[PDB]
Amino acid sequence: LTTAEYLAYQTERHVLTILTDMSSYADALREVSAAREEVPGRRGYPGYMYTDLSTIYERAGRVEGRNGSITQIPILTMPNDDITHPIPDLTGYITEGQIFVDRQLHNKGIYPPINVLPSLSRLMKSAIG
Amino acid sequence: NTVSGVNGPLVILEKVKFPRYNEIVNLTLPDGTVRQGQVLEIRGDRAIVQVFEGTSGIDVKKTTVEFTGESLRIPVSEDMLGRIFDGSGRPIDNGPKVFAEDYLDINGSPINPYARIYPEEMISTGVSAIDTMNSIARGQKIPIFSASGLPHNEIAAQICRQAGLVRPTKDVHDGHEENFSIVFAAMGVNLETARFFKQDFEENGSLERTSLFLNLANDPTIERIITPRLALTTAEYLAYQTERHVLTILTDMSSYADALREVSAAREEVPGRRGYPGYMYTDLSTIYERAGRVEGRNGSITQIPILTMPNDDITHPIPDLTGYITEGQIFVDRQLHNKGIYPPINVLPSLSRLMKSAIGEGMTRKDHGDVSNQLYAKYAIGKDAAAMKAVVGEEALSIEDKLSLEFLEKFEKTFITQGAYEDRTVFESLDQAWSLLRIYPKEMLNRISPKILDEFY
Amino acid sequence: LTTAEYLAYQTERHVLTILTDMSSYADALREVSAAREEVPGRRGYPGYMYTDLSTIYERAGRVEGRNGSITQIPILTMPNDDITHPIPDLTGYITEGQIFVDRQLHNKGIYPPINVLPSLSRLMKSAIG
Amino acid sequence: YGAIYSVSGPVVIAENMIGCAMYELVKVGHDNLVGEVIRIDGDKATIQVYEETAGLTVGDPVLRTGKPLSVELGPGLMETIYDGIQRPLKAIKEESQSIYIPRGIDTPALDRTIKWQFTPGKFQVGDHISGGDIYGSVFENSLISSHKILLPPRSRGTITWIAPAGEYTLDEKILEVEFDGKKSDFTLYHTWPVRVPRPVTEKLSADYPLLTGQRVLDALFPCVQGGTTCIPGAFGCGKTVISQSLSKYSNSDAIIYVGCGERGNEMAEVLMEFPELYTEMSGTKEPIMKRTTLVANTSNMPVAAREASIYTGITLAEYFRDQGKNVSMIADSSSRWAEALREISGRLGEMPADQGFPAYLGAKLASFYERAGKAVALGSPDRTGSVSIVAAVSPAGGDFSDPVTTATLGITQVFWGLDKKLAQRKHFPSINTSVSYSKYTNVLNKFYDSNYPEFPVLRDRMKEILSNAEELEQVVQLVGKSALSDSDKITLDVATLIKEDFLQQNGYSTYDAFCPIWKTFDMMRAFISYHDEAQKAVANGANWSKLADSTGDVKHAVSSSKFFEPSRGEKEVHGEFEKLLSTMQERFAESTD
Amino acid sequence: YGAIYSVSGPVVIAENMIGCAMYELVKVGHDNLVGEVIRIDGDKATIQVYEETAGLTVGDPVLRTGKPLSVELGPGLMETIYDGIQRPLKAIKEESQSIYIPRGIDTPALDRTIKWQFTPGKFQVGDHISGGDIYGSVFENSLISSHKILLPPRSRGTITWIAPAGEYTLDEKILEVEFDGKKSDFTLYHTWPVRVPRPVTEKLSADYPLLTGQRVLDALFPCVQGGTTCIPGAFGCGKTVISQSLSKYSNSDAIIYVGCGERGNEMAEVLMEFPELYTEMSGTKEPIMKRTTLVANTSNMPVAAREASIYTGITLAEYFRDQGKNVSMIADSSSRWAEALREISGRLGEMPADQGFPAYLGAKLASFYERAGKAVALGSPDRTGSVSIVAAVSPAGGDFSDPVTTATLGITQVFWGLDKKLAQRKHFPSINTSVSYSKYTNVLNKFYDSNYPEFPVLRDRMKEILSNAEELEQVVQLVGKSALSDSDKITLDVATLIKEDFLQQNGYSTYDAFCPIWKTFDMMRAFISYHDEAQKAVANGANWSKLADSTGDVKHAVSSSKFFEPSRGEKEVHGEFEKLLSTMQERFAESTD
Amino acid sequence: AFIILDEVIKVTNRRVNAIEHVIIPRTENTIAYINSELDELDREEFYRLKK
C-alpha cells in the first residue's frame, strides 16, 4: 500500500491494489494479545477491529494532483457463510458498496459465479462517462 | 492527604483511616470549585470515592481534601410540599431553602417500619384499563412496562393530573379518608419531558401538593442514582408526619440501571449477565422495600415506577428483575398505540398479585374481582383467536368464536379508549363490562358462580 | 475404577462399572479453580476438564490376559437438556458413539423412552459377528 | 481482639485475627453488625458484613463469638416471626418502635421473659440417654406439643437428676447429665449450627401422601411427604396463593414458612391470613399460625438473613422431624437465595461460572434438598417424621435454560412447570403434562387405590387426554380443524374444560381453592366417563356439534361443580357427583341414536 | 513537564505528574502527538494517544497545553473545513502539501494570520458586564453577523479596557476584565470544553416554527426545531442525498454539518458541491458554504477526533443559540460515533457491556440530545435561538437490535423512516406514516393554527387517509375490485395525491428546492376539499368514473402545483389553489345533478 | 374444474397466512433468545481473564 502511494503520487499512475485475504489479516490481529492487558470484543475479535480495518482503508482514494489514483479491492472470505459475522459487517459500513459471490452458481458450474443479486456499486453513475 | 489518582468516576484518595462509612469528604480543586464526594471504599490509608459533582478533571497534588466528618443524610422536612428541587436538593427554579427538622440517612432503610399488615383499600385514577384488571391497593407497587415507540410519558402524566380529582369521590366511599400527595422523581430525562411533568401538576392545581425532583442525563451518573433515593426519604417523612398517601412515580428505570452498570464495569467487581450488574437486583431492591403502610396506620407509600424497554423485550435483565420484586405489572403495547387507541395499555398479560386484597366491599363491589377473572380470560383467548382467524379463515372459526371476535373489538375501542380528561368510576366500569360480557351464553361464562351470573348477565 | 482394574487383571473377570452421575462430577471440578492459578476456559468450565474426564475413562478396555475386560457405562443427565452443552459435548468425543434418551417419548407414556435417531455407535459393526 | 483494616462495600477486612472458622460468627464494631468470616488472607480475615452500613468507623473492635452461625432449638419458637439471623420481629416492634430491624442493633434470639410448662418424659433417673431422646415436652399448641425437648446431638450419658413436673423458665436448668464428670447442666433450649445438618438414625422411603389440597397438583402429578418440588417463575406463578394453600391444607403437624428476601407485603399477607382461617381439625390460639412458625425477610433487609433463611428454616424442620413430627417446609423463593451467591461472588471479586452465577450454587443446592425427606426419628424411642421441601425459583434471563432453574431441575424429584399463555388467561398454578413430572406418581397411585379412589387408571387417562390435545392443537392453528375428525374435536373440548376448571384455584371461596383427595377423584372420574362415552357416540353415528348441544346444561353443571363445598354426601364424595354419572349414561343413549 | 515511563500499545504512561487533571490535553514526546489523560494512578498518568506513536521513546518530555480537549470558537469559522478536534484541514492542504494531516504535524485550531475588523457593541469603560452580553460583532456573511463577540461564560466583572472599532489580530487583545484583579485579557476567540455544555438562561419545549423547506416533514408529522430526530440509514439508501438537500433548502441561519467518521467520498461531495449550489433565500460569496461550517472526519481519522466530533459541532451550535440565531445540526452518523467508543474501551481494557458495546453508551447518547433544543439565549438582551438535531443511526451489528439504534429511539420523540424503494422511485426523503411518529406534533400544529393556516385539522385528516388506504389495498389483492365501493375507490385517489404532491420530490423546479409554509397548506386544503364533496356526491347518486371524467382539468391542476410558482395569488399564497375551491364547488353541483 | 379450483384456492390461501404470521416470527424470536445468551458467554470470559 505504501509502495503504491509513491507510484501514484510522483509519477502519476492509476493503481489497482488487490489484497487477499483480509480474513487472515483479521485473525492475526485477534491472535496477537496473550500478555497484553487489552481485551477483545464479540466472537473473540477485537473491539478495535474497526481501527485495524481502517488502517488498510486509509491508503485508498484519489492522490493529490488527481490523474493518478490508488484503487483498492480487498478480498474477504466468509469461513462459515455468515453475513452477521463481525468481519464483513464492520468493513461493509466503511466500504462504498460490496460484491457478493455465492456458492450456488459455482455449483451449476458457471465460472466466475458472481450473483449480481445483492451486489451494489453506490457510485455507479459517478464512474461512467 | 491529597489525591493519588482517578480511574473513571472512582477517585483514588490517599487519606487516613479515621473517617466512617459514607462519610462526606470535600475536594478542593485549584479551579475555584468545591466538589463533594462520599466514601464508597475505605482501605489501608487510602479511600475510593464517587463524586456527586463532576466525573473528571481531578488532579494529584493540586487537589487536596478536608473531611467533613458528617455521614450522608437528607434533611427531610414535611413543609417540602410545593417546593421544586433538582437531583441533589438544590433549587433550580428558586423553590424554598431545604432547612431541616429531621435528618435520615439513605440506605433504603431509614427507620423502616414497612408493612406487616397488607393494603386493602383502593385507589382509582378513573382509568378502567388500569383499575379493573389491576386493582391497585394502598401500598402495593405495580410498575408500568412499556417499550420504545410508545408514549409512556403521557400515561404517567394521565395518572398525575387525574389523581387528585378522583380521590375525594373515593373519600366518601371509604376508598380514602385522607389527602393525596404525589412525589415525582424524574431520572435521566430530557428538558422537554421534565417540563411536561411540571406542566401537568400546574395545570391541575396540585403544584402545592407535589414534590418534583428533576435529574437530567447530562448531570453526573452518580447524581442520578441518588435522585430516586432522595425522593423516597422525603416521601417516608410526609407519610409519617401528616398521614397522607403518597404515590411515588419513579421514571425512568432504565436510566437508573445504565448508571449502576457504569459503576460496576468500572468497579473491581465483575458484573452479572449481559454486562448488567451482579448486585443489580440489590440496587433495584433498595427502592422497593420502601413500600406499604407507615406507623400511625393512615399514611402509606404506594409505587408506580415507569420502565421503558430499551431493547423491546422481557428477555432483558431490567424487566425480569423488576417484575420479580414488584407485585404485578401494567403492560403497554405497541400495536394498540399504532391503531389510535389512547391510553394504549394492553390487558393481555397485565396482572395483579394482590388483586383480592385490594378489592373490598365497603368501597368497591365484591363482583369487581369476579368480573375481572372473566375479562382477563376472555380478552386473552380472544386476542389469540383473532391471530388464528387470520390463518384459518372461517373453516375452523365457530359461531361462539365470532362472539369472542366481537368482544375483543368492543373492549379495545371502549374499555381501553378514553381521553386524557375522562374520569370513570369503578361502578361504571363494572356495568360496561357486564354488558359486553352479556352476549356469551350461561355455559360459556363458567369461571364465575351461578349466583352472580344470574343476577347480572 | 482402580478396584475394577484389579478385578479384570488379576482374576480375568468381566467387570462392569456403572458410574453415575457424571454431571455431579463435572460441577465439582468447576467449583475448584476459583483460587488456583489455573484459569477456567469456555462457559466457565476448566480447559482441562477434558483431561479430568479422560483419567476416569482410561480404565475401560480389554485387559491383558484377554479373558478379562472392564466395560464401563457412564450415566450423564444433561442439566440444560441440549447436547451442545459442555458436559455431553466433550464426553461424546472421547467415547465412540452415543445413546439418546428423550423427553418426548416419556410424555406420551413410554418406558424406557429411547430415541435412536442421533444414536449411533461407530465401532458397532466390527465388534460383532 | 480485631482491628478493622478496610471497609470496602459490604465486605470488611480486619487485621489481628485469630481463630476464625469459615462460618464463624463475628460481630463487627461496637454497633455489633452481623457478619461471617468468608476468607482469610494472611493474619487478616475477610468478613462480609451483610447488615446495612452508613456509619462504621474503621479501626473499632471486632468481637468473636467463638463459634459458627447457629439457631436455638427449644420451646417458644412456634408462633413467633423471626428473621434468618434470629431476632424476634415481634420484640423488635415493641422496643424499637419500628416494625423492621434498624441497623446498628442486635438483641437476644428467644424472649427470655416467659415461663414454660415442663412435663416429664420417658427418661427417669438412671436411664441412659443419647441425643434426640425425648426428655420432656412443652405444650405450645392446644392439641399437641409442638416442642418436644430433646437432648442436643453428640450428647450422651446417664441422668443423675430429672427435675419434677412444674413450670420453669427456659433460662432455668432442670437437668444434669453425667458423662466424664459433671458434663454440664442443661436448659430447655440448646443451640445447633445451621451449616451442620442434624443427624438421623436412618432414612425411610417416602410412601405417605402430601395432600397439597389442590386439584391441579393432585390430579396431574401428585406429590409425597418426603418430596422435593421445583416451581419456575416469571411473575405469573401465583406463589403466594399456592404457598398460603400449602400452609393451611397440608396435614403436616408443623409448617415452617420461609421468606427468603421477598416483597415484604406477601409475607405480611400469610401472617395476617392464618389467624383469620381455621384449622383442619379444630383448635384456636390463632389457628393455622399456632402450627406455623415464620422466617420473614424483605429484599433490602440484611443479606445474612436472606442467605441463612433456607438453612435456619430446614434446621427448624429437622428438629421437628427428629421429634417425629411431619413437617412441610416451604421455601419462597430460593432463586433470590441463589442471587445472593451471585452478589457474594461479585463483591469478593472471585470469577463466576455460567452467566455470572457461581459453580458452588449446584453443590450447595443439592445438599439442601438432601436434608429433607422421610425418615425414622433420631434417638432411642424411634418415631417417624418428614420434611417436604417445596421451593419456588425464577429466571432472570427470560428463558428456562438459565443456571438457577437448571441446577434445581437436575436435583428435583417433582416439577410443576409454568406455561405463560395459560397464566395470561389466568389459571394459577398452570401446567401441562409435557412440562411437569413426578417420578413419585407410581408408588403414590397404589397407595391411593387402597384409600378408595380409582386413582391409577385416572392418572394414565389424565396424561393421555392432555398429550393428545397438544399435538392436535398445532394442526388446528396452522392447517385448519378440517383435517381433524370429530373424536379428536372432542379431545380439544374435554381438555379445555379441565384447563379452566382444575388449574384455576385462585377462587373467591375456600371451596374453589381446597379440593380434597376425594373431591379431586370424583371430578376426574366424571370427566373421563364423558370422554369415553363421547368418542363412542360419535363413532357409532353422532356429531361433535350435535353431542355438544345435547349435554349442554349437564356440561355447565360439571364446570360449576368446583364452586360447591366439599363437606356433603358421605364426606366430599357428594350425591351431586354420583347422580351426575347416571345423567351422562342417559345422555349417551340420546347422543348416539 | 512529565517524563515518559512506559509506552504499551497505543497507550502512553508517564511519570512526574503532580498536576495533570483527567481531561487534560497533553502533547507527548517531541513528536507532539495528540493525547488526553484517561486515568491517573499515583504519580503516573494513563494517556490514550490517538495519533501513531512509532518513533516515540521513554525518558522523553510530556508538555501540557494547560487545558483539556477543547474547541476554539472564534471568527473566520465560515468557509472552513475542520476536523472534529478542530484544526483547519484547508491550511494543511496548502502548507504540508498533503490533504490529510499525518503524524507529528499540528497546527493551531483556527487560522491565526487572519485579521478581522471588530466593531464594538453596547459596552464602554467602567460598565459592569456579564456572560452572554454582546461586546461587538464581526461579519463573515453579507447576510448576518455570524460571529457576535460575546463576553465569555465563567467571566463577568467590570471592563477596564475596551478597544475601539478597528482591525485586530486574533492574537491581539481587545478586552480586559477586572474580576479579582485582572481576570485575564481576552481575544476574539474564546475557548470552550467539548463535553461541558454551555449555560443558558433557560431551555424551553421545542416549538419554534421554521421550515427545513422539505414539505413532507412538515405535512405528515410537523417538523420541529429544537427537536431531536433519528433517521435509519444503511449507507446507500439515499440518506446522504437528503442531508445535502436538508442543508440547502433550510432558511436557518447556519447549518453545521458533522461527518462523524464517514466514507470520506461523501465528505468530498459536501466540500465541493455546497459552494456550487445557490441559496434559497439569496446570498453570494460561496452561497451554501458561507452559511455552513463543516466538520469532516472520515472513518480512518483518529478515534478521538471522531469521538469528539458530535460534541464539537453541537458546541458551535449552542454558542450560536446563545447569540440568538437558529442553527440546524446534521450528523451522519451516531452508529459510527458509537463504534469509536468500543474501540477506545477495548484498547484500554475498560470493560464494555451489552452486545459488546460500552456501558458508557446510554448516558452519553442521552447527554448529547439534551444539549440540543430551544432556549432563550444567554445574556441580558434575551433572544430566542434553537438547535435542531438530526442524527442518522445505522446497524452496528448488522441488525437494528444494536444498542445504539434502539437506545436513541427511546430518547427521541421524532422518528422518520427511510427506504431504498422510495429513493429508487425518486422520492427523497422517504417518510411514511407507518414507520414514523412525532410527539412534538400537537405543539407545532397549534403554533401554525395561529398564523393563518388551518393546520391542525388538516394534518389529522391527512394521516388517517394514508392509513385507511393501506387496508383498502389488501382487499384489492385478495378479493379484487368487485367488493370495493365508489367511496373506497375515492380514498385511494386522494391518498395517491397526498403522496405525489408531498412525498415525491427530486428538485424538479426551484419550487421543490424551496417551499414555504403556505404552499404546504394550500396543497392539503385542496385534497380534503375534494374528498368530502366526492364521497358525498357518490352517496347522492354518482360514480367514481363520472367524477373522474368531469373533474379532469381541476384535478390535473392540483397534481402539478409542485412545478408551478406559489406566487400566483399573492406572493407565497398560491392562486392555483384559491380558484380551485370555487371550481370544485361548481364541479359538485354538476356531479350530483 | 371450477368447484375444485374453488376448494384448492381456499387451502393455498390458508398456507400463505400461516407461514407469514406464525412461522417466520417464531424463527426470529428463538434466534434472538439464544443470541443474547451466547454473546454474554464470550464476553464474560474476557472480563474473567482480565480480572
Q: What are phi and psi of D323, to 5 degrees?
A: -80, -25
Alpha-carbon torsion (C58, C59, C65, C67), positive or negative: negative
Peptide bond into B252 cis (omega under 30): yes
The CA-based diameter of chain B, rounded to the nearest angstrom, is 84
Q: Is E564 exposed, middle or buried (0-12, 13-18, 19+ CB in 10 A)?
A: middle
Q: CB–CB of D207/D85 below 8 Å?
A: no
Close Cβ partners of E580 (under 8 Å, ≥ 6 residues apart): E526, E529, E554, E557, E558
Q: CB–CB of E164/E120 below 8 Å?
A: yes
Chain A residues with CB under 8 Å of E303 CB are: 51
Strand partners, D228: D389
CA E289 to CA E276: how far, in whole Å? 9
CA E498 to CA B40: how far, in whole Å? 61
C-alpha distance across the termini of chain B, in Å: 79
Q: Collapsing DSSP states into helix, strand and coil, what is residue B271?
A: coil
Q: CB–CB of D303/B108 below 8 Å?
A: no
Hunting for cell 408462633 — which residue is that? D79
C-alpha distance across the termini of chain F, in Å: 75
Letter string b/e over residues D378-398, b meaning 16 or more CB atoms within 10 A of that residue's CB: bbbbebebbbbbbbbbbbbbb
Taking CB atoms and an 8 Å limit, are C43 and D354 in contact across chains?
A: yes
Q: CB–CB of E386/E320 below 8 Å?
A: no
Query: D233 a known binding residue?
Result: yes
CA E215 to CA E519: how far, in whole Å? 9
Chain C and chain A touch, per 3+ beta carbon pairs within 8 A: no
Of E23, E352, E411, the CB nearest to B190: E411
Q: CB–CB of D566/D514 below 8 Å?
A: yes
| Residue C63, C-alpha cell as written in the block | 485387559
Query: Across E341-448, where does the E strand assignment appear?
Result: 373-376, 384-393, 414-415, 437-438
Of D363, D401, D433, the CB nearest to C31: D363
| Residue E169, C-alpha cell as written in the block | 489580530
CA D4 to CA D148: how far, in whole Å? 43
Identify which of B377, B354, B433 has the alpha carbon closest to the alpha carbon of residue B135: B354
Q: CB–CB of B82/B75 below 8 Å?
A: no
Identify which of E264, C104, E337, B395 has the alpha carbon closest to the alpha carbon of residue D477: B395
Close Cβ partners of B72 (under 8 Å, ≥ 6 residues apart): B22, B23, B24, B38, B105, B106, D54
CB pairs under 8 A between A and E: 75
The rounded Cα E393 to chain-centroid distance in angstroms is 13
Q: Collapsing DSSP states into helix, strand and coil, what is residue E376?
A: strand
The CA-based diameter of chain D, rounded to the nearest angstrom, is 93
Angle (CA) D249-D251-D257 rounded to 5° is 70
DSSP string, D516-534: -HHHHHHHHHHHHHHHHHH
CA D540 to CA A112: how far, in whole Å? 68
Taking CB atoms and an 8 Å limit, are F40 and D479 in contact across chains?
A: no
Q: How many CB atoms lie within 10 A of CB A82?
A: 13
Q: Report the chain E residue with the minimal C-alpha distance to residue B272.
A: E353
Question: Is the CB of residue E346 less than 8 Å away from at least one CB of chain F?
Answer: no
Close Cβ partners of D380 (under 8 Å, ≥ 6 residues apart): D129, D130, D133
Element (H, E) at B299: strand B299-309
Question: Is the CB of residue F26 less than 8 Å away from at least one CB of chain D?
Answer: no
Give the orientation angle of helix E517-541 with respect to helix E575-592, to 10 degrees: 0
Question: Is the CB of residue F20 less than 8 Å away from at least one CB of chain C?
Answer: no
Q: Collapsing DSSP states into helix, strand and coil, what is residue E44?
A: strand
Chain B residues with CB under 8 Å of E413 CB are: 192
CA D209 to CA D445: how far, in whole Å? 10
Angle (CA) B186-B190-B196 rounded to 5° is 70
User: Which strands, in side-by-side order, build the sheet including E182-186?
Assistant: E128-129, E157-162, E175-178, E182-186
Residue E491, CB-side half-sphere exposure with 13 Å CA sphere? 16
Peptide bond into A21 cis (omega under 30): yes
CA D521 to CA D498: how far, in whole Å? 13
| Residue B227, C-alpha cell as written in the block | 435522585
Chain F residues with CB under 8 Å of A44 CB are: 42
Give the orientation angle of helix A49-57 with respect to helix A22-31, to 10 degrees: 140
Nearest-neighbour CA in chain F from C67: distance (Å): 48
Q: Is D427 exposed, middle or buried (0-12, 13-18, 19+ CB in 10 A)?
A: buried
3-state secondary structure D157-202: EEEEEECCCEEEECCCEEEEEECCCEEEEEECCEEEECCCCCCCCE
Q: How many CB atoms lie within 10 A of CB B91?
A: 13
Q: How many CB atoms lie within 10 A of CB E67?
A: 12
Q: What are phi and psi of D539, to 5 degrees?
A: -65, -45
CA F1 to CA E586: how far, in whole Å? 52
CA E556 to CA E551: how far, in whole Å? 9
Taking CB atoms and an 8 Å limit, are B292 and D268 in contact across chains?
A: yes
Close Cβ partners of E522 (under 8 Å, ≥ 6 residues apart): E561, E566, E573, E574, E577, E578
Q: Alpha carbon of B84 to those of B58, B96, B207, B239, E539: distances in Å? A: 31, 8, 9, 19, 58
CA D3 to CA D14: how far, in whole Å? 5
CA D268 to CA B403: how far, in whole Å? 42
| Residue D92, C-alpha cell as written in the block | 423488635
Q: CB–CB of B19/B65 below 8 Å?
A: no
Q: CB–CB of E178/E158 below 8 Å?
A: yes
CA E429 to CA E307: how far, in whole Å? 28
C-alpha distance across the termini of chain C, in Å: 29
Q: CB–CB of E346/E352 below 8 Å?
A: yes
CA D449 to CA D456: how far, in whole Å? 7
Q: How many CB atoms lie within 10 A of CB A107?
A: 9
β B299-309/B245-251 pair status: parallel
- C36 an active-site residue? no
Alpha-carbon torsion (B167, B173, B179, B181), positive or negative: negative
Hunting for cell 462509612 — which residue is that? B21
Taking CB atoms and an 8 Å limit, are D355 and F37 in contact across chains?
A: yes
Q: List, in sequence order, the alpha helices (H) in E201-251.
A: 215-220, 239-249
Dihedral angle computed from the Cα positions of residues B370, B372, B373 and B374, in that order, rounded to the nearest 10 degrees: 100
CA C50 to CA C44: how far, in whole Å? 14
Of F14, F36, F41, the CB nearest to D480: F14
Letter string b/e over residues B102-137, b meaning 16 or more CB atoms within 10 A of that residue's CB: bebbbbbbbbbbbbbebbbbbbbbbbbbbbbbbbbb
CA D200 to CA A58: how far, in whole Å? 76
Identify which of E105, E98, E134 has the alpha carbon closest to the alpha carbon of residue E118: E134
Q: Is E461 exposed, middle or buried (0-12, 13-18, 19+ CB in 10 A)?
A: middle
Give the orientation angle of helix B426-437 with respect to helix B367-392, to 10 degrees: 40
DSSP string, D380-408: SS--EEEEEEEEE---SSSSS-SHHHHHH
Of E44, E351, E366, the CB nearest to B188: E366
Counting every residue written for chain F, the total comes to 51
Question: Is the CB of residue F39 less than 8 Å away from at least one CB of chain A?
Answer: yes
Taking CB atoms and an 8 Å limit, are A43 and F42 in contact across chains?
A: yes
Identify which of B12, B281, E108, B342 has the alpha carbon closest to the alpha carbon of residue D306: B281
CA B425 to CA B441: how far, in whole Å? 27
Q: What are phi and psi of E254, to 5 degrees?
A: -140, 160
CA B361 to CA B350: how far, in whole Å? 23
Region of residue D283 (phi > 0: left; psi between -120 and 50: alpha; otherwise: beta)? left
Identify which of E322, E327, E371, E326 has the alpha carbon closest to the alpha carbon of residue E130: E322
Q: Which residues of A are catalytic?
A: 122
Element (H, E) at C117: strand C114-120
Q: CB–CB of E357/E342 below 8 Å?
A: yes
Provide the 8-state DSSP code for D296: -
| Residue E573, C-alpha cell as written in the block | 399564497
C-alpha distance across the termini of chain D, in Å: 93
The alpha carbons of chain D give a radius of gyration, in whole angstroms, of 27
CA D38 to CA D43: how far, in whole Å? 14
Q: Collapsing DSSP states into helix, strand and coil, what is residue E497?
A: helix
Query: Across E52-172, where does the E strand assignment appear?
Result: 61-68, 70-73, 81-82, 115-120, 128-129, 134-138, 147-150, 157-162, 166-169
Region of residue E180 (phi > 0: left; psi between -120 and 50: alpha; otherwise: beta)? left
Q: CB–CB of B106/B229 below 8 Å?
A: yes
Close Cβ partners of C66 (under 8 Å, ≥ 6 residues apart): none
Q: CB–CB of E259/E499 below 8 Å?
A: no
Q: CB–CB of E254/E292 below 8 Å?
A: yes
Q: CB–CB of E261/E298 below 8 Å?
A: yes
Side chain identity, residue E191: T
Nearest-neighbour CA in chain F from D356: distance (Å): 8
Q: How many CB atoms lie within 10 A of CB D588?
A: 21
Strand partners, E88: E82
Peptide bond into D354 cis (omega under 30): no
Letter string b/e over residues D88-117, b meaning 16 or more CB atoms within 10 A of that residue's CB: bbebbeeebebbbbbbeeeeebbeeeeebe
Identify which of D198, D586, D237, D272 has the alpha carbon closest to the alpha carbon of residue D390: D237
Give the orientation angle of helix B280-288 with respect to helix B253-265, to 10 degrees: 140
Given resolution (angstroms): 6.9
Q: CB–CB of E264/E300 below 8 Å?
A: yes
Q: CB–CB of E304/E101 below 8 Å?
A: no
Taking CB atoms and an 8 Å limit, are F37 and D398 in contact across chains?
A: no
Identify which of B287, B306, B160, B167 has the alpha carbon closest to the alpha carbon of residue B235: B287
| Residue E571, C-alpha cell as written in the block | 406572493
CA E387 to CA E226: how far, in whole Å? 5
Chain F residues with CB under 8 Å of D479 CB are: 14, 18
Query: D495 a known binding residue?
Result: no
Provide the 8-state DSSP code for C43: G
CA E420 to CA E520: how far, in whole Å? 25
Q: How many CB atoms lie within 10 A of CB E457?
A: 14
| Residue E574, C-alpha cell as written in the block | 398560491
Close Cβ partners of C76 (under 8 Å, ≥ 6 residues apart): C21, C22, C23, C87, C88, C91
CA D223 to CA D250: how far, in whole Å? 11
Nearest-neighbour CA in chain E from B192: distance (Å): 5
Q: Report the chain D residue with the minimal C-alpha distance to residue F13.
A: D479
Query: Across D410-528, where does the E strand assignment appear?
Result: 414-415, 437-438
